[PDB]
């Protein structure tokens, strides 16, 4: 009769406990293993994969592939904004449903850099230049290309390359930021501007489209696992 | 600038992602009838959250930790002085093909071979682990095929799901008062292996036996591309 004293927490079922349990099927000969391609070991392996971003969330475009199309056109203006969304990968609609955002919504905290790949799907004869800028928080969303000029930005020439990667760095007061919207964990604003108007020849379409892809860089991690708010249930599906 | 913040990605491993107990299904049984026993066909698609987490992958392989939360309640009664003694319950697993209880007092409850747990109310929830019990080299989450070679009959994951039935009963005898109980099944994948990731579910689930969905929007909407 070994003397023992039960401590608080006994006869307790903690969802996230990691104890050993007696097997109900002793000596069960499991089927051997097979080398199935594409083994995943971490959900960051998924979050690091580029996925198309629905930048054009317009009510009418959201239920169509028009959601993913960023319109650009040959203009008479000089520095017209192309698009602008906040850097809320897990909260704002522009990114919350991306691959990255879908993974983020299972965790509470996030930290790291972000790849924004922009692919120009216009005619081979079209050219132009764009200013892709990430403005950290504290100020307002840049209202002019001049305002955006003062933050981390990139001049993307369409003529030479069709794809261009803006790598948004992790510039934050804290080591992590909340996946959910909190001003404290502000993120910034990502804008695009016309650096040089899209010049097209005769008999070529002057209005083209751009696709945006989001992924995580090698320095991205998540924390405080939770349930996603995207899935809902009223009764057991049958 | 140079930075040396090595934030470990430990909690985003598949093991941590899936290794948390989740309510997959719960059913009821009462001390009133002779067929009051409860039964459940074992699937992972009746529950939304766990299913979505698993459906993030096409092929999975893992052991399972089963925890049962059995809750009882006094049901309305007409006689006087319901002095109910401690209630004991039996959870029986009937593998596909075994005899099936047709009544609360069937011979099947002997479970000479069929695994089963006997648990008394008021103690730690019963728990039991079970190996990887699939016929293939991995559990299948999706199946772009049929059950019959004639490209007819059944189409989907319900041609692969055959995991047996789970029966529940009061071992205690009928008393002067009725008693209704609710068993809650909890799945916890241990030692997990995943293959071939796939896009997360966007449209709400509609049926347990198929992908059937009602189309939903790609994402939430804003007023403009510049709206911030």
């Amino acid at each position: 009769g070994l003397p023992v004293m039960t401590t608080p927490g006994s006869t307790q079922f903690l969802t996230s406990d990691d104890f050993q349990s007696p097997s109900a099927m002793p000596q069960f000969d499991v089927t051997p293993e097979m080398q199935i391609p594409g083994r995943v070991n971490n959900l960051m392996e998924i979050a690091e994969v580029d996925s198309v971003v629905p930048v054009n969330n317009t009510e009418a475009n959201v239920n169509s592939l028009k959601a993913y199309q960023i319109p650009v056109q040959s203009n008479s203006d000089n520095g017209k904004q192309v698009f602008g969304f906040p850097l809320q990968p897990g909260a704002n609609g522009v990114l919350n449903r991306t691959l990255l955002g879908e993974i983020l919504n299972y965790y509470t905290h996030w930290s790291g850099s972000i790849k924004l790949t922009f692919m120009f799907c216009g005619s081979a004869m079209a050219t132009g230049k764009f200013l892709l800028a990430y403005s950290p928080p504290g100020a307002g969303v840049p209202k002019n290309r001049k305002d955006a000029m003062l933050g981390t930005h990139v001049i993307w020439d369409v003529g030479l390359q069709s794809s261009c990667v803006l790598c948004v760095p992790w510039i934050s007061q804290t080591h992590y930021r909340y996946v959910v919207e909190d001003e404290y964990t502000a993120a910034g604003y990502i804008t695009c501007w016309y650096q040089t108007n899209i010049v097209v020849p005769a008999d070529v379409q002057s209005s083209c489209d751009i696709l945006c892809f989001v992924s995580a860089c090698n320095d991205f991690s998540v924390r405080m696992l939770k349930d996603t708010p995207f899935i809902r249930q009223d009764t057991f599906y049958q | 600038r140079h930075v040396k913040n090595y934030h470990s990605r430990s909690e985003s491993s598949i093991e941590n992602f899936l290794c948390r107990a989740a309510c997959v299904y719960y059913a009821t049984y009462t001390n009133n009838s002779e067929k009051g026993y409860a039964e459940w066909v074992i699937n992972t698609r009746q529950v939304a959250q766990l299913r979505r987490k698993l459906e993030l992958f096409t092929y999975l392989r893992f052991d399972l930790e089963l925890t049962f939360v059995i809750t009882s309640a006094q049901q309305p009664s007409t006689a006087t002085s319901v002095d109910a003694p401690v209630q004991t319950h039996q959870i029986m697993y009937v593998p596909p093909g075994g005899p099936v209880p047709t009544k609360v007092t069937d011979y099947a409850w002997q479970t000479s071979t069929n695994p089963s747990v006997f648990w008394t109310e008021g103690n730690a929830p019963p728990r039991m682990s079970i190996p990887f019990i699939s016929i293939g080299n991995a559990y299948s989450c999706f199946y772009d095929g049929w059950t019959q070679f004639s490209r007819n009959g059944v189409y989907g994951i319900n041609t692969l799901n055959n995991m047996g039935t789970l029966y529940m009963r009061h071992v205690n005898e009928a008393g002067q008062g009725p008693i209704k109980s609710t068993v809650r099944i909890y799945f916890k994948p241990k030692h997990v292996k995943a293959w071939v990731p796939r896009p997360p579910r966007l449209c709400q689930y509609e049926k347990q036996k198929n992908v059937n969905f009602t189309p939903t929007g790609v994402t939430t909407t804003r007023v403009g591309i510049t709206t911030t």
């Binding site: 349990s21 097997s23 069960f28 | 941590n16 030692h191 997990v192």
Partner: peptide, 16 residues
């Protein structure tokens, strides 16, 4: 680590 059960399925998760 010390395992109390004869079947590997009874062991804790592989988190380390």
């Amino acid at each position: 680590n010390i395992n109390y059960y004869k079947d590997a399925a009874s062991n804790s998760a592989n988190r380390q």
